[PDB]
């Protein structure tokens, strides 16, 4: 079942409660690292009182999430580069990549300007702004049918998606590996990009 | 967004700024239209120096407009610090003159009634000075001499809007912000049909003037403590009037003279007719 | 970000110049004295928890209304956001005594920081005092350490200091 | 696992960067670092066995209460599992000290501790008395920068648990 | 991310035990040997750009094919991701070298990078043979550089050797 | 500004955490490396111009179409732009040695350095050949530890024209 | 591929939108603009052989050390790989051209152009200098709206190589 994802995101309705504020500092978590439990001493605590004193939106909270020592040790470092591309499309988008040529772009990016230029680039995105905007949760997508598609990423976002008890976990024995086939990936596309 | 802290975080000059935008940045999601919230209907957001013209740029286009972009070291250090000036050192001229007892005077008179702007040596009103020192006028009618005079008609009021010039001759000549926008109207009107110089004398010839200052006290600022028929958002208007000891009057900034005093916020304290 | 090093850098630059032998041999004294300034921030870090505990204790010692209803150190929530500025600004004066240059918590702590807790109503001079507490703690560390060679750190006891009392002024 | 390379090496790989001066100075200082490091190291390693006995005793002499019936300082399992623990902890200290930084320590102890502490009612305070007697007696074994490194260490855990 | 020593650790906690007399003297060797590893990385990193043109000139002389059109370096577009894949390969293969260990060359660089390419139509033999070139060149920089103290530095042109190998088996 | 204190420092800023042992041992590398690399900045720093002269005019040598009429090696204003360009670089090279980091070389002088010479037609050939030199002549103005720093320095500079 | 009919798809597409009459009065520019186009691409591809000889050459007499020993302008197999760039930014054009747009200079000639030029030591200048060379002479092949056409892709390649 992917009963859960059609949606719904969770925000930050101006004048917010601490009791709807701590469902989103929860949600943006499970959002970011999947099932996979965060120990409270490896909470982002600085980011956290940072968005509790309203001086950033959700969409900056993501941005030093994303940037933190603890999402590159889980995600970064036990996986290879694709896989990271795969994961980081699928935890700051919620689909999977369209093309084999988004990939080359990402990979090229992140060899020239580094780690944190390449998580930018998704949140400084039009994409990102259109759909989920500042006050919104990153959440699943590719169970819609959503304009300017590729029927493709329905499939591989579901093969990507192992449900809500699947760890995106980096301890699998095998690790960190990839999941979409780059043969399958090359169907939609492929150009001398 | 708003009301930030600190600066930089790799390292980074951030400036904070400030927009009105269409639903197109930010809307509900809600069932029908698209709309904004209404009280961001000028929102602010603090930027580091990179992805400032980025953001520029995405914001002109999907339709916002840019009010203001003004760095965020400026606009941390808080408000002026008021303290010179909550209570001030009054300066009078008595009867005898003592040679320098009306020394004291005229520098005094100039840093008020110019707001603190500097006047050189070329610049001083010589022969009016002259007729203080012998009694022959008055320190309030040597403070009516100075607003007529060119160099006041040439820093406040030739380049500038009539809302300005207004707004900084209750400054200046009675020590207090504006109150209300009947005061503004009611001043532009008389302009327009007795000319400057009726228009002038009607700040110097005033009631209120008169009770304060009386005849030989220089005008002094007076609007950081309470006053009588004194709307209370006139005591956050001062803060906008006033920036502080360093700060000055200036009609040589970039920008050029401008308001201060946002036209939408007098009108909080009351609009009438006429 | 700047630290001893970067400062003198920029202010060469500004001149179009190589740096100065006499700016040279400032920065030749800050590495002399730097296994001495490793002792100092090693101080503050290997005690944070008690040094912002203890200057906490005492805060609320000295103003018991923070901890009332109505106080700004109450109820849970409250004290945890006071404690964590505690440790925030603490952690950042530790960065600029390591880096020998303010900037950092100039820059990232105390820019804006007095306009923040206006807005909140949160009490200025109270967070002032605790700093000073803070100040008053780190340097009793800094000054009183487990088997660190004998000499003289007065130099950057002061330094710490300036950098509590940028904090504490800014704040106030 | 964090140590002075491992965080290099990330630092220059998210900006897509070769490793310049910048990067192998730091490396040099983690080098230059091992011998009083290491020493350390050796010394809490041959000491193990009493510096954990002792420790343990201290916990049950701070809180006498502990040792009584009912209590969680009682019978062999209590007991036994507290050695352990404080043998853990100085296992990871050793690591931290061998390794050039913390890493070892945040990923086997600090991550979660809270947690697990809470869940089985064990009270840092306890492990804080532990790791005070462990620092005091570390004091006599070592000196100079091996002294500093294992109190570095100790007092990362100390912290930790406050 | 494991380093040599990180690798130590990590077998010895899977015995439950402190680190053998043993690891502990493999580990004084590394720290030993550890200027020539800086040099040796340093040879690399100085070089980088001569070491990926250089192997790509000799890659394209050799496979002419590459470069006509249906070739898989034409035209601009996949030469510059060739480039970039050659830099990429390069530089994580400094990070094993700087690190006395693979790991970080395996986990992100190497692990499905053969799948990828094959699913690209990338020929990944003639990928391997571009690595390959690269480890001539670059370990020639290592054995010859701008007067670096005379010595021994075979065990780390061999142990960089088997990171260009690693890369070019794992792709091949 | 990168040097190994600002990079642990911002390393330790962006996890919300107080500088530990893994970050103090990077430091003390960064300071026990001082006394090299200001030698080496000692040297380079009294021993300066004529690097530029020579450097300048080995340009037009190696590319003679340079110093030829029409040409952009010709006249007072190129000849005087071009030494003070290689003036620039020697001078930041000099502040990366003393800062501890390549940050002076990537702020001044990397950033930007291709849009600017693109649109100015000034080819980095040039600049590599004018660095190739000082590097030829480095080598007998230092030795050990301040040269294998002054040759860091000037390779980065050579990689990030190539 | 960017041509006057991909872009106002690609604009209807994302939008999830039928094409409207802005769309289609669009396209009927590329098709009434193609009897210029396709005059300015059949004399360009008659004409290559000797408009890349011309060009080829121009390049050497513009910057004659090339040509000399040592040199990049030397020997059969870089005057070689020369003419065949040349012939490849010739039929690029043609292809744009025929094409109604740039997309097939975008594509394969500009998107990567600085890296490749930059690893291989290729100057632009002398690529510019073969453009300005095939411009002179197709002002005397074509005229009217397809010498318009032919200079509107010479001039954006000159243009993406500055
Ligand atoms: C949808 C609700 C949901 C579930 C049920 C869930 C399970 C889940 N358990 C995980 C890990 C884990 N689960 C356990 C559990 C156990 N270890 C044992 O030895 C015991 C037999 C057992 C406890 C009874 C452990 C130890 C890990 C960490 C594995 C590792 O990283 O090595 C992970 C990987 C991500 C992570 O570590 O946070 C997921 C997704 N995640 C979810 O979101
Ligand atoms: C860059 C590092 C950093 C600092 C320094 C920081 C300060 C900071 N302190 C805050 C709140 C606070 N700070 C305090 C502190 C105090 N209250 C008192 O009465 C005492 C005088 C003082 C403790 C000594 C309190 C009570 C609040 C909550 C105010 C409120 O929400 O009403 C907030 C608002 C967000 C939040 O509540 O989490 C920020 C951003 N934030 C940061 O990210
Ligand atoms: C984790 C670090 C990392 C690596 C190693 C990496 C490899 C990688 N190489 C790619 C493409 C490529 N790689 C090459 C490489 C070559 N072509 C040849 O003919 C030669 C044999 C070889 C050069 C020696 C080419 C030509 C492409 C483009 C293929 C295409 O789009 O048609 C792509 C597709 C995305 C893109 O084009 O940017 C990836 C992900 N990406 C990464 O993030
Ligand atoms: C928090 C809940 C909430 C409110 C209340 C809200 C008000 C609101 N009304 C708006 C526009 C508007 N509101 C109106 C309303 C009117 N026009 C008239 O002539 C009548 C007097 C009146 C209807 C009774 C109109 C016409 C606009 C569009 C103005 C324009 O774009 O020109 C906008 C600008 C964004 C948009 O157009 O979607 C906001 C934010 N937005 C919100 O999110
Ligand atoms: C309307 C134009 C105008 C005139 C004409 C004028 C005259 C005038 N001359 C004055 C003083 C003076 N005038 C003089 C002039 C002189 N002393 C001598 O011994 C000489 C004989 C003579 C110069 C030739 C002196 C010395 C004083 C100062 C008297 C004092 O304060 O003791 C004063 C007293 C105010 C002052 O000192 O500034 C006036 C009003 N004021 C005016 O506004
Ligand atoms: C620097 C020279 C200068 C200008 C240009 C100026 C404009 C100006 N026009 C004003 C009012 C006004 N202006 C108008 C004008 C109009 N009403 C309409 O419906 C028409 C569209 C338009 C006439 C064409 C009206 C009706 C008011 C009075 C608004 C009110 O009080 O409700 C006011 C407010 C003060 C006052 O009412 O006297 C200013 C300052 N003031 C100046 O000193
Ligand atoms: C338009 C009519 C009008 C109002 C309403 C008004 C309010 C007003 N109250 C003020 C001060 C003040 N108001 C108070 C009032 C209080 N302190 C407390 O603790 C209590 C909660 C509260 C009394 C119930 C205090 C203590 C100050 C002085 C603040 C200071 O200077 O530190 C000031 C600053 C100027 C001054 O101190 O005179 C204004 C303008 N002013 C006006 O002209
Ligand atoms: C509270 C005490 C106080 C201070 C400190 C003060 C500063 C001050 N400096 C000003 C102008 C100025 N300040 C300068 C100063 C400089 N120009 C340079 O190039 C140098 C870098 C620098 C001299 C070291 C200049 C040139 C202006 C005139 C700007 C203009 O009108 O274009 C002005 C505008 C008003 C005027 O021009 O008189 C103020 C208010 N005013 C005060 O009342
Ligand atoms: C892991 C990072 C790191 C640290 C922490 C470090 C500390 C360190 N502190 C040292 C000296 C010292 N440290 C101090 C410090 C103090 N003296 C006092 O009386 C005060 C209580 C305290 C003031 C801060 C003194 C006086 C010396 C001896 C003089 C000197 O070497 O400058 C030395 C020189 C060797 C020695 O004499 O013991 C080292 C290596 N080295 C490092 O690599
Ligand atoms: C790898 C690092 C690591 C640590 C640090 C660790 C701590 C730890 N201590 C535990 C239990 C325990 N810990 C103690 C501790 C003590 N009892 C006493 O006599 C003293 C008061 C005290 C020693 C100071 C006790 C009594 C238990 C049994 C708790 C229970 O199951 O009821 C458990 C529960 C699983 C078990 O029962 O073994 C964990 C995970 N586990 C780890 O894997
Ligand atoms: C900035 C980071 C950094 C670097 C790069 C560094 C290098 C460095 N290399 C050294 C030695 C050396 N380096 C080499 C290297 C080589 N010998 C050869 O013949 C080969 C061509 C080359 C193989 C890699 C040798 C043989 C020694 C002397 C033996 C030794 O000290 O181990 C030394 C000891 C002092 C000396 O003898 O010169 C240092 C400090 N130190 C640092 O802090
Ligand atoms: C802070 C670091 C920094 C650097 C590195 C720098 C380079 C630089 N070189 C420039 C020009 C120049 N650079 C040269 C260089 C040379 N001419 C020759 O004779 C030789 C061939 C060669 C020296 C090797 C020439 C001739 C110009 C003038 C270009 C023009 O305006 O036409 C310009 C254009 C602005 C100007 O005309 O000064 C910049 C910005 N600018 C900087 O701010
Ligand atoms: C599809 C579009 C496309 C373009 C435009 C292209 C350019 C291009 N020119 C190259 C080489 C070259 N380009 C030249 C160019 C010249 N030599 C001279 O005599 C003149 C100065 C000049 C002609 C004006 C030379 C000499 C080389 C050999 C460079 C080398 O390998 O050393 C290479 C390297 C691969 C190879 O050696 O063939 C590429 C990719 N490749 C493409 O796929």
Not at chain 1, 157 to 173: F, I, P
Not at chain 2, 264 to 273: D, P, T
Request: glycine share 6%; hydrophobic share 35%.
């Amino acid at each position: 079942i992917t009963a859960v994802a059609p949606a719904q995101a969770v925000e930050l309705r101006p004048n917010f409660g601490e009791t709807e504020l701590q469902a989103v500092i929860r949600a943006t978590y499970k959002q970011l690292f999947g099932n996979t439990y965060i120990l409270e001493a490896d909470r982002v605590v600085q980011a956290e009182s940072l968005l509790r004193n309203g001086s950033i939106n959700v969409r900056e909270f993501v941005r030093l999430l994303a940037k933190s020592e603890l999402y590159k040790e889980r995600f970064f470092h036990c996986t290879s580069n694709n896989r990271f591309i795969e994961l980081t499309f699928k935890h700051l988008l919620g689909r999977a990549p369209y093309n084999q040529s988004e990939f080359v772009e990402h990979l090229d990016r992140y060899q020239k300007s580094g780690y944190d230029a390449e998580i930018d680039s998704y949140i400084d995105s039009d994409e990102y702004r259109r759909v989920f905007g500042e006050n919104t949760v990153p959440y699943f997508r590719g169970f819609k049918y959503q304009t300017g598609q590729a029927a493709g990423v329905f499939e591989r976002t579901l093969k990507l998606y192992g449900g809500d008890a699947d760890s995106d976990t980096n301890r699998n024995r095998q690790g960190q590996l990839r999941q979409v086939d780059p043969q399958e990936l090359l169907r939609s596309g492929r150009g001398i990009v | 967004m708003n009301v930030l802290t600190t600066s930089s975080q790799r390292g980074g000059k951030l400036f904070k700024v400030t927009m009105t935008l269409s639903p197109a940045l930010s809307h509900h999601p809600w069932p029908s239209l698209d709309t904004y919230e209404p009280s961001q209907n000028s929102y602010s957001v603090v930027v580091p120096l990179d992805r400032l013209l980025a953001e520029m740029t995405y914001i002109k286009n999907k339709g916002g407009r840019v009010l203001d972009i003004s760095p965020a070291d400026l606009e941390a250090l808080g408000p002026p610090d008021i303290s010179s000036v909550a209570i001030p050192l009054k300066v009078e001229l008595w009867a005898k003159a003592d040679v320098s007892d009306v020394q004291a005077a005229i520098v005094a008179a100039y840093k008020q009634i110019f707001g603190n702007t500097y006047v050189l040596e070329s610049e001083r009103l010589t022969s009016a000075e002259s007729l203080l020192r012998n009694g022959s006028i008055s320190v309030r009618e040597f403070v009516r001499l100075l607003a007529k005079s060119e160099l006041y008609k040439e820093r406040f009021f030739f380049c500038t809007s009539n809302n300005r010039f207004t707004e900084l001759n209750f400054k200046h000549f009675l020590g207090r912000a504006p109150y209300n926008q009947s005061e503004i109207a009611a001043h532009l009107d008389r302009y327009q049909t007795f000319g400057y110089d009726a228009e002038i004398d009607s700040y110097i010839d005033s009631d209120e003037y008169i009770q304060a200052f009386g005849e030989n006290v220089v005008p002094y600022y007076r609007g950081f403590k309470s006053q009588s028929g004194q709307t209370v958002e006139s005591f956050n208007r001062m803060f906008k009037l006033y920036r502080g000891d360093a700060g000055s009057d200036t009609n040589l900034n970039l920008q050029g003279q401008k308001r201060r005093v946002d036209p939408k916020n007098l009108l909080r304290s009351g609009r009438g007719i006429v | 970000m700047q630290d001893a090093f970067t400062k003198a850098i920029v202010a060469a630059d500004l001149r179009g110049s190589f740096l100065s032998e006499q700016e040279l041999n400032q920065l030749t004294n800050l590495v002399k004295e730097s296994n001495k300034r490793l002792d100092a921030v090693n101080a503050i870090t290997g005690n944070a928890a008690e040094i912002i505990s203890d200057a906490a204790h005492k805060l609320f010692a000295e103003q018991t209304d923070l901890i009332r209803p109505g106080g700004n150190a109450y109820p849970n929530r409250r004290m945890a956001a006071c404690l964590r500025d505690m440790e925030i600004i603490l952690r950042y004066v530790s960065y600029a005594l390591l880096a020998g240059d303010a900037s950092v918590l100039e820059d990232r702590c105390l820019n804006g920081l007095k306009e923040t807790y206006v807005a909140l109503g949160t009490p200025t001079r109270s967070v002032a005092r605790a700093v000073q507490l803070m100040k008053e703690t780190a340097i009793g560390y800094v000054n009183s350490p487990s088997g660190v060679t004998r000499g003289d750190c007065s130099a950057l006891v002061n330094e710490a200091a300036t950098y509590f009392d940028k904090a504490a002024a800014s704040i106030a | 696992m964090k140590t002075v390379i491992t965080e290099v090496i990330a630092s220059a790989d998210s900006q897509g960067r070769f490793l310049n001066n910048t990067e192998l100075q730091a490396a040099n200082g983690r080098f230059q670092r091992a011998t009083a490091s290491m020493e350390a190291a050796r010394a809490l390693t041959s000491n193990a066995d009493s510096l954990v006995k002792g420790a343990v005793q201290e916990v049950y002499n701070k809180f006498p209460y502990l040792t009584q019936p009912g209590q969680m300082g009682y019978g062999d399992t209590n007991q036994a599992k507290c050695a352990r623990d404080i043998s853990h902890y100085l296992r990871f200290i050793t690591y931290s000290l061998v390794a050039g930084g913390t890493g070892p320590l945040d990923d086997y102890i600090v991550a979660g501790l809270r947690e697990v502490n809470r869940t089985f009612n064990l009270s840092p305070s306890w492990y804080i008395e532990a790791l005070k007697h462990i620092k005091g007696k570390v004091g006599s074994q070592l000196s100079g920068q091996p002294l500093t490194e294992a109190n570095a260490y100790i007092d990362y855990c100390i912290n930790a648990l406050s």
